[PDB]
Amino acid sequence: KPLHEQLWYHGAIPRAEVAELLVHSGDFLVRESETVKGAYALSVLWDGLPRHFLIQSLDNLYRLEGEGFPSIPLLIDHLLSTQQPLTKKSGVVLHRAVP
């Protein structure tokens, strides 16, 4: 389905509204980056601190560190279903798609 129909996708929203929507550790959403042209960010509350990961792509695969997926929803689904860290160094984990 379209990115804009995904449960966790909030489009172009201001930081004030992201900070209000992410309430507990593991809460996350996907949004447009304000400062990186055309880019998406995965924003996750982790240990009291909002964390923002630019969703990268290479060879038509979306990814944060390891090998990626053909779409952003497939990447999110993988992270949410496996509870594997977004990157090795960060240790951040997705738990709740904020609707």
């Binding site: 960010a41 923002h52 630019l54 990268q56 977004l86 990157t87 160094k89 960060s90």
Partner: peptide
């Protein structure tokens, strides 16, 4: 800093 490494 705002975004994680790329």
């Amino acid at each position: 800093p705002v975004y994680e490494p790329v």
